[PDB]
Amino acid sequence: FDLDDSIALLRLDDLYIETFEVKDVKTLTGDHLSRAIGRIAGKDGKTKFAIENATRTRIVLADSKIHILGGFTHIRMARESVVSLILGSPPGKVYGNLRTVASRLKER
């Protein structure tokens, strides 16, 4: 993680790290595995940056290993979106669902 993002751990007392692995979600191999990773990042990192802004977390896509830093509910709101791309959902649809959750955060 970036240093400035990591300083939040010192700043906060309710920030945790959620870590899991793509084969845990679904057994992907070869080019199928590589494509799934691209979907999480997206073009120019656009997809992760969407996941980044809306759910209010940071995500590190270290090859097949994903680490999510944020609040407990917020990391959980980040996780399913990551999981959904792995299982085959197009980035465009989750972008719509992602912008829905972004709303309920600002009202609450």
Binding site: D31, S34, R35, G38
Partner: peptide, 10 residues
């Protein structure tokens, strides 16, 4: 493009 560009970058 697509995977080819990524594989080119490596």
């Amino acid at each position: 493009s697509g995977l080819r560009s990524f594989l080119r970058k490596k």
